[PDB]
Design an enzyme around this catalytic site. Sequence first.
Site, PDB file in Angstrom:
ATOM      1  N   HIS A  83       0.810  -1.240   0.000  1.00 21.31           N
ATOM      2  CA  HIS A  83       0.000   0.000   0.000  1.00 21.31           C
ATOM      3  C   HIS A  83       0.826   1.265   0.000  1.00 21.31           C
ATOM      4  O   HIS A  83       0.793   2.091   0.938  1.00 21.31           O
ATOM      5  CB  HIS A  83      -1.001  -0.030   1.170  1.00 21.31           C
ATOM      6  CG  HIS A  83      -2.087  -1.045   0.989  1.00 21.31           C
ATOM      7  ND1 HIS A  83      -2.166  -2.164   1.720  1.00 21.31           N
ATOM      8  CD2 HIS A  83      -3.122  -1.101   0.073  1.00 21.31           C
ATOM      9  CE1 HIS A  83      -3.207  -2.893   1.305  1.00 21.31           C
ATOM     10  NE2 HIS A  83      -3.799  -2.232   0.299  1.00 21.31           N
ATOM     11  N   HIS A 123      -6.750   6.903  -3.138  1.00 24.61           N
ATOM     12  CA  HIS A 123      -7.595   5.948  -2.416  1.00 24.61           C
ATOM     13  C   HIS A 123      -6.929   5.200  -1.292  1.00 24.61           C
ATOM     14  O   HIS A 123      -7.636   4.631  -0.480  1.00 24.61           O
ATOM     15  CB  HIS A 123      -8.254   4.939  -3.383  1.00 24.61           C
ATOM     16  CG  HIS A 123      -7.382   3.773  -3.700  1.00 24.61           C
ATOM     17  ND1 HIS A 123      -6.358   3.858  -4.562  1.00 24.61           N
ATOM     18  CD2 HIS A 123      -7.386   2.474  -3.217  1.00 24.61           C
ATOM     19  CE1 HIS A 123      -5.728   2.675  -4.611  1.00 24.61           C
ATOM     20  NE2 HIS A 123      -6.342   1.835  -3.774  1.00 24.61           N
ATOM     21  N   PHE A 295      -8.437 -16.917  -3.552  1.00 18.32           N
ATOM     22  CA  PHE A 295      -8.689 -15.496  -3.830  1.00 18.32           C
ATOM     23  C   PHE A 295      -9.291 -15.277  -5.224  1.00 18.32           C
ATOM     24  O   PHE A 295     -10.363 -14.643  -5.407  1.00 18.32           O
ATOM     25  CB  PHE A 295      -7.357 -14.752  -3.695  1.00 18.32           C
ATOM     26  CG  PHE A 295      -7.448 -13.235  -3.855  1.00 18.32           C
ATOM     27  CD1 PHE A 295      -8.375 -12.502  -3.160  1.00 18.32           C
ATOM     28  CD2 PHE A 295      -6.535 -12.562  -4.646  1.00 18.32           C
ATOM     29  CE1 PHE A 295      -8.418 -11.116  -3.281  1.00 18.32           C
ATOM     30  CE2 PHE A 295      -6.567 -11.170  -4.782  1.00 18.32           C
ATOM     31  CZ  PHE A 295      -7.506 -10.459  -4.098  1.00 18.32           C
TER      32      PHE A 295
HETATM   33  C1  LIG Z   1      -4.632  -7.494  -5.071  1.00 20.34           C
HETATM   34  C2  LIG Z   1      -3.493  -7.852  -4.123  1.00 20.34           C
HETATM   35  C3  LIG Z   1      -3.948  -8.974  -3.224  1.00 20.34           C
HETATM   36  C4  LIG Z   1      -3.573 -10.304  -3.497  1.00 20.34           C
HETATM   37  C5  LIG Z   1      -2.697 -10.637  -4.700  1.00 20.34           C
HETATM   38  N1  LIG Z   1      -4.010 -11.278  -2.698  1.00 20.34           N
HETATM   39  C6  LIG Z   1      -4.787 -10.940  -1.626  1.00 20.34           C
HETATM   40  C7  LIG Z   1      -5.339 -11.935  -0.793  1.00 20.34           C
HETATM   41  C8  LIG Z   1      -5.172 -13.291  -0.977  1.00 20.34           C
HETATM   42  C9  LIG Z   1      -5.865 -14.037   0.007  1.00 20.34           C
HETATM   43  C10 LIG Z   1      -6.532 -13.225   0.885  1.00 20.34           C
HETATM   44 CL1  LIG Z   1      -7.539 -13.826   2.279  1.00 20.34          CL
HETATM   45  S1  LIG Z   1      -6.320 -11.595   0.514  1.00 20.34           S
HETATM   46  N2  LIG Z   1      -5.180  -9.670  -1.384  1.00 20.34           N
HETATM   47  C11 LIG Z   1      -4.800  -8.699  -2.131  1.00 20.34           C
HETATM   48  N3  LIG Z   1      -5.189  -7.433  -1.881  1.00 20.34           N
HETATM   49  C12 LIG Z   1      -5.882  -7.038  -0.754  1.00 20.34           C
HETATM   50  C13 LIG Z   1      -5.594  -5.805  -0.183  1.00 20.34           C
HETATM   51  C14 LIG Z   1      -6.192  -5.395   0.982  1.00 20.34           C
HETATM   52  C15 LIG Z   1      -7.122  -6.183   1.618  1.00 20.34           C
HETATM   53  C16 LIG Z   1      -7.825  -5.646   2.876  1.00 20.34           C
HETATM   54  C17 LIG Z   1      -7.444  -6.474   4.072  1.00 20.34           C
HETATM   55  O1  LIG Z   1      -6.274  -6.495   4.508  1.00 20.34           O
HETATM   56  O2  LIG Z   1      -8.366  -7.065   4.618  1.00 20.34           O
HETATM   57  C18 LIG Z   1      -7.475  -7.427   1.063  1.00 20.34           C
HETATM   58  C19 LIG Z   1      -6.853  -7.877  -0.145  1.00 20.34           C
HETATM   59 MG   LIG Z   2      -7.441   0.433   0.553  1.00 22.96          MG
HETATM   60 ZN   LIG Z   3      -5.766   0.061  -3.014  1.00 25.72          ZN
END
Ligand SMILES: CCc1c(C)nc(-c2ccc(Cl)s2)nc1Nc1ccc(CC(=O)O)cc1
Ligand SMILES: [Mg+2]
Ligand SMILES: [Zn+2]
Length: 345
Positions: A83, A123, A295
Site C-alpha cells: 500500500h 484511495h 482469492f
Molecule cells: C490485489 C493484491 C492482493 C492479493 C494478490 N491477494 C490478496 C489476498 C489473498 C488471500 C486473501 Cl484472504 S487476501 N489480497 C490482495 N489485496 C488485498 C488488499 C487489501 C485487503 C484488505 C485487508 O487487509 O483485509 C485485502 C486484499
Molecule cells: Mg485500501
Molecule cells: Zn488500493
Amino acid sequence: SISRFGVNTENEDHLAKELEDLNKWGLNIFNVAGYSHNRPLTCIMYAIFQERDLLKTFRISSDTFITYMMTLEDHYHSDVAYHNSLHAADVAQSTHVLLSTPALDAVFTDLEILAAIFAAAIHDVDHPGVSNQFLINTNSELALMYNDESVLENHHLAVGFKLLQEEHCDIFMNLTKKQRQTLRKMVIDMVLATDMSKHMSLLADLKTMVETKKVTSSGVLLLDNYTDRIQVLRNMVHCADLSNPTKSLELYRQWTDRIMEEFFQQGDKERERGMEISPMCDKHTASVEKSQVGFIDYIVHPLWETWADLVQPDAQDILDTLEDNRNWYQSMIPQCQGLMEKFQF
Ligand SMILES: CCc1c(C)nc(-c2ccc(Cl)s2)nc1Nc1ccc(CC(=O)O)cc1
Ligand SMILES: [Mg+2]
Ligand SMILES: [Zn+2]
Ligand code: NA
C-alpha cells in the site's frame, strides 16, 4: 523533462518508451517507477492528465498539479510493502484504461472521469500497512475516530482532501462551486467503495445492475442517470483495486510478493503483542499459492466475470489472463473463513 513527464529523470528515453503503453492494460508500472526516480504516482498522473486533456478542460495549472501530486505521493509510505505510491499509481493507470473500454464510450461526463482518476490516486494515501480489522482490534485512534466503519478509507479521503488546502496545492481552484461539490461527492463515494469488506454487497448490487443492462446496436452501454453512472464508477475503481491477478504473471507475482510481505509484517506486530495472528498474516503457516487460487476463484473471478458481463466483449482478454494466472498458481501449490471474511460484513 518536468514539462514532458512532470518528474525529473536520468533516462527520459526509457521512461518515454514505457509511457507508450499508457493506454494499455499491459503497461509496466514497476519500470515506470524505475525510470522516474521512484515517482510512479506523480509521473503516471501527469501522463494520464495530459493524455485526457483534463488540465485544459478543468483549467488546472500543470505546475500546481505537479506540486499536489508530489505531496500526495510523499504521503504514501515507502516502507509499507504493498500500500505505497506504486499501488496507487497502478490503480490510477488501471482506472484510466477501464474508462476507455469501448462499451463505456461517451457514457461519463468529464467531471466523472476526473473524479474517478483522482479517487484512484488518493484511495490509499497514508496507509499504515495494517488492515482496518487490526486497527479496530488494537483500539487504535483511527478506529476510535471513525467508529470502526471504513476506517482507513475515511482516512485516505480526509488526507487527500486536506492536501488540497495546503498553499500552492489547490488543483481545483478554477472549478465552479457546483463542480467542486459534485466532484467531492463522487470521490468520497468511490473511495469508500474500496473498503474490501463491502466487496460482497457491492458485487451483489452490481449483478443486480447488470441484469438490467441495455446497449446500443454498437455495444455501448445505456446508463439512465447519475445513480447508474456512479454505481459503474465505484465498481470500476474496486476492480482496478483488485486487478493485480489480471495482469501478466510477471507483474502479478511481484504484487503477490508485496501484499504477502505487508500481511506478514502485520502478523509479526500481532505476534509481538500476544494477539491471535490474523488470516494470511502468519509467515510460519502461510500457503501463498493456495491462497491466491482461492482469492481468484471466490473473490477476483466472480467480480471480473460480472464486470466482463457488463462491458461484453471488451474484458474477455482480462478474464483469460486471470484464468491463466490461476492455473499457474494452482500448478505451484506444493505436494475458507479467513479468506471470505476480509471481503464481507
Ligand atoms: C490485489 C493484491 C492482493 C492479493 C494478490 N491477494 C490478496 C489476498 C489473498 C488471500 C486473501 Cl484472504 S487476501 N489480497 C490482495 N489485496 C488485498 C488488499 C487489501 C485487503 C484488505 C485487508 O487487509 O483485509 C485485502 C486484499
Ligand atoms: Mg485500501
Ligand atoms: Zn488500493
Ligand atoms: Na513516501
